[PDB]
């Protein structure tokens, strides 16, 4: 949960979220 | 003097739907897209088609390169020697239709190549390669593609192929909703723009290339695509984000599927399979694979439909019964 701004991956993004 | 109407003329605004494209590339996404252009607005005006020529020449030039260095890592012979010239003559003439033109001296390099032994002899081996499939489509109409007055067809355009690395974002109505759909191309952006995309969605699409059961392992994998594919749809179906969302599964490619499964065994895939190698079965199969990797609550099912994306009639009935699915679930 960094900043928004920050490029991510999809699998990155999923991970965080759960 | 008649005093002017109602602006709104008794109309309401428009209920909105928001769809998730998902899926691994070649999966059939952007087709979808196009498709749903075609079906729910006015398709590709002649000034827009015109504007894929460059794209069909560079799909065609890029597909006949893949699998002529195919042949080199495979150790295939041309049919005929003279053909090692053309090839190289490829490689010159590569960067020579940039400009929407393929010069006659390019179109019969290409004609000659594509008509050997040993490149058609590698052509039947693309599974080694994980050649796209759209390279057929246009190496066998070249004749047509390459005269000077060519104007891409609607189905030309269907079958081109674009880089999509971000979210792209379309817009549709139908029976009377407003569907804001969000093909996810790519693999990487920023957080704030995951989170905006996944909000309020409606309806998840999500995109599965049957055909690509038979694809060799390459070095950049740990799994096969299809796996690569289960993985990602179970990601994406037990997410916090959609507990609650309408997931629809497009088993897609289903044509090239039905050619595949007649001499390519689905143990290719799934080495554990015990089922015959015909079409509804093995298709049956895959359904069964995706569909297990659902563990949200019982209510909460898969929405699964077989599909050719690139046959205009078949999207648009499927995507009828998708829009009386999400009503329902509405
Ligand atoms: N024969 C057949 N070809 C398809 C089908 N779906 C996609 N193709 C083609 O396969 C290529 C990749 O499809 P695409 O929509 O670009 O996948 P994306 O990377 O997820 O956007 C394209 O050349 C499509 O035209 C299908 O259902 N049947």
Same mark, same amino acid.
């Given at each position: 949960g960094?900043?928004?701004?920050?490029?991510?991956?999809? &699998? &990155?993004?999923?991970?965080?979220?759960? | 003097?008649?005093?002017?109407?109602?602006?709104?003329?008794?109309?309401?605004?428009?209920?909105?739907? @928001?769809?998730?494209?998902?899926?691994?590339?070649?999966?059939? $996404?952007?087709?979808?897209? +196009? /498709?749903?252009?075609?079906? !729910?607005?006015?398709?590709?005006?002649?000034?827009?088609? $015109?504007?894929?020529?460059?794209?069909?020449?560079?799909?065609?030039?890029?597909?006949?390169?893949?699998?002529?260095?195919?042949?080199?890592?495979?150790?295939?012979?041309?049919?005929? %020697?003279?053909?090692?010239?053309? %090839?190289?003559?490829?490689?010159?003439?590569?960067?020579?239709?940039?400009?929407?033109?393929?010069?006659?001296?390019?179109?019969?390099?290409?004609?000659?190549?594509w008509?050997?032994?040993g490149?058609?002899?590698?052509?039947?081996r693309?599974?080694?390669? /994980?050649?796209?499939?759209?390279?057929?489509?246009?190496?066998?109409?070249?004749?047509?593609?390459?005269?000077?007055?060519?104007?891409?067809?609607?189905?030309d355009?269907?079958?081109?192929?674009?880089?999509?690395?971000?979210?792209?974002?379309? !817009?549709?109505?139908? @029976?009377?909703?407003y569907?804001?759909?969000?093909?996810?191309g790519?693999?990487?952006?920023?957080?704030?723009?995951?989170? !905006?995309? #996944? =909000?309020?969605?409606?309806?998840?699409?999500?995109?599965?290339?049957?055909?690509?059961?038979?694809?060799?392992?390459?070095?950049?994998?740990?799994?096969?695509?299809?796996? =690569?594919?289960? +993985?990602?749809?179970?990601?994406?179906?037990?997410? @916090?984000? #959609?507990?609650?969302?309408?997931?629809?599964?497009?088993?897609?490619?289903?044509?090239? #599927? =039905?050619? +595949?499964?007649?001499?390519?065994?689905?143990?290719?895939?799934?080495?554990?399979?015990?089922?015959?190698?015909?079409?509804?079965?093995?298709?049956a199969y895959?359904?069964?694979?995706?569909?297990?990797?659902?563990?949200? +609550?019982?209510?909460?099912?898969?929405?699964?439909?077989?599909?050719?994306?690139?046959?205009? @009639?078949?999207? /648009? #009935?499927?995507?009828?019964?998708?829009?009386?699915?999400?009503?329902?679930?509405?």
């Amino acid at each position: 949960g960094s900043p928004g701004s920050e490029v991510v991956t999809l &699998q &990155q993004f999923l991970e965080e979220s759960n | 003097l008649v005093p002017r109407g109602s602006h709104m003329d008794g109309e309401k605004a428009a209920k909105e739907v @928001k769809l998730l494209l998902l899926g691994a590339g070649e999966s059939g $996404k952007s087709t979808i897209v +196009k /498709q749903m252009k075609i079906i !729910h607005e006015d398709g590709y005006s002649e000034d827009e088609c $015109k504007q894929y020529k460059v794209v069909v020449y560079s799909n065609t030039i890029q597909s006949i390169i893949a699998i002529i260095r195919a042949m080199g890592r495979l150790k295939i012979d041309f049919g005929e %020697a003279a053909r090692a010239d053309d %090839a190289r003559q490829l490689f010159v003439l590569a960067g020579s239709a940039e400009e929407g033109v393929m010069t006659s001296e390019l179109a019969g390099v290409i004609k000659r190549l594509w008509r050997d032994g040993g490149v058609q002899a590698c052509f039947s081996r693309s599974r080694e390669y /994980q050649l796209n499939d759209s390279a057929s489509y246009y190496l066998n109409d070249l004749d047509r593609i390459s005269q000077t007055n060519y104007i891409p067809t609607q189905q030309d355009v269907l079958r081109t192929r674009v880089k999509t690395t971000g979210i792209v974002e379309t !817009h549709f109505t139908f @029976k009377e909703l407003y569907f804001k759909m969000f093909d996810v191309g790519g693999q990487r952006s920023e957080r704030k723009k995951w989170i !905006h995309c #996944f =909000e309020g969605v409606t309806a998840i699409i999500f995109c599965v290339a049957l055909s690509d059961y038979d694809l060799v392992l390459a070095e950049d994998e740990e799994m096969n695509r299809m796996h =690569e594919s289960m +993985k990602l749809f179970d990601s994406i179906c037990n997410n @916090k984000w #959609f507990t609650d969302t309408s997931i629809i599964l497009f088993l897609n490619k289903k044509d090239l #599927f =039905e050619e +595949k499964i007649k001499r390519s065994p689905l143990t290719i895939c799934y080495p554990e399979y015990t089922g015959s190698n015909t079409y509804e079965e093995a298709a049956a199969y895959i359904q069964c694979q995706f569909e297990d990797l659902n563990r949200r +609550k019982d209510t909460k099912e898969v929405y699964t439909h077989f599909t050719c994306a690139t046959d205009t @009639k078949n999207v /648009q #009935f499927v995507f009828d019964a998708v829009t009386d699915v999400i009503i329902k679930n509405n």
